[PDB]
Amino acid sequence: TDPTLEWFLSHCHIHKYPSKSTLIHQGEKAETLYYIVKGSVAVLIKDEEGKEMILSYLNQGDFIGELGLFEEGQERSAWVRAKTACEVAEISYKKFRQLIQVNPDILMRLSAQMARRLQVTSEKVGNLAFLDVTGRIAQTLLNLAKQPDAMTHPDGMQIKITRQEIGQIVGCSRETVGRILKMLEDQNLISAHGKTIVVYGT
Amino acid sequence: DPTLEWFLSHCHIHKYPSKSTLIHQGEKAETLYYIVKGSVAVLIKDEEGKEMILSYLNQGDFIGELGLFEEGQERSAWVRAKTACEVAEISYKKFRQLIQVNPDILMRLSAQMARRLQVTSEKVGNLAFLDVTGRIAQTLLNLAKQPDAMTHPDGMQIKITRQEIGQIVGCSRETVGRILKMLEDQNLISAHGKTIVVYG
């Protein structure tokens, strides 16, 4: 029971989007804010040759499309598509500004999230500039393992993720992920049960 | 500006010499900064010491705001004076009260975070989709756009050491020398002393 959220949501018309539908479309004009009441989404940017990179996964309790909130003429800086089906609250930027004068804690929450995103996206920059593709993949496994949805295992931390996705995160061919995962195993660093990696603590 | 002057009235100002570290990665965050004068380099390091410049920051930019919205936070990057600096300074504690009195000061902060997230996301794109060559190209053009870029008969003459380009694009000092050579061969830039005449 959160009085602030409930108060916030009561100003938003909620919507359900089926899995795989694009909630935000890059390049569109920014003039609306979003909040995930139910679901999970991927934020991602395309390459010149159509290759998609996943900047971030966002879940229930995350704001979406906030980056154009503090100025107009802004465009959505990325794509957001429903990973699973989502229940998503919506409110105009303007209407959201008013709420901020009543209770700016709803902005603290928003910004807190912006704060985290910036920290993580910065690590990516580091990884992308400091690590070969093997190390990038190692750090992406260690990263999904740090996470909440990462089940404990007698070896290390069990995660669940396709090779395609691992590719989209680190920035390479799924075929390449396959070969590199196999190598990481032969080095006693992980297991591979199809779409189930056990990241050893090593 | 009313709101910035009001904000600054509550801060304790400090001057940092050039080369000084304002923020150390790993420190406990409980202070918000605002740059009244100067410019800094926000940057990260390799498990072996190599440096990456995430961003520069200038007069009117907040620093150290990432640990504001929660506690137990630690400084996520080093921040060094790139020139002489006058930095306003304030506890999060005191800043949270300012937010209550007038949230417009949070909007100003939030507005900068939005920008930095857009821009660092851009940077993730560049690193993942461009070879060191296309990023040094990327960078020299951007450095012409930026303010300090002089005017040259051929094109904005910018000044930066080779290493500082690599701290940006994420390559070695030598890989910069080789790339700039290819760029100078294709008649795309000049290079005398340590200045660069990117051709406009």
Ligand SMILES: Nc1ncnc2c1ncn2[C@@H]1O[C@@H]2COP(=O)(O)O[C@H]2[C@H]1O
């Ligand atoms: N690096 C990132 N990490 C997390 N979410 C992001 C990142 N970059 C963009 N987004 C989200 O993608 C959304 C799409 O358009 P906006 O720029 O309006 O708001 C964006 C952010 O909410």
Ligand SMILES: Nc1ncnc2c1ncn2[C@@H]1O[C@@H]2COP(=O)(O)O[C@H]2[C@H]1O
């Ligand atoms: N990607 C970035 N772009 C701009 N400024 C950054 C970036 N990453 C970190 N910073 C700044 O570096 C500061 C150092 O520690 P904080 O986490 O306290 O607050 C940080 C941010 O203000």
Ligand SMILES: Nc1ncnc2c1ncn2[C@@H]1O[C@@H]2COP(=O)(O)O[C@H]2[C@H]1O
């Ligand atoms: N992947 C990288 N390899 C080498 N240097 C890097 C890398 N990423 C960032 N750098 C920094 O870029 C700088 C460029 O030249 P230096 O050899 O003087 O010091 C370098 C490093 O500190």
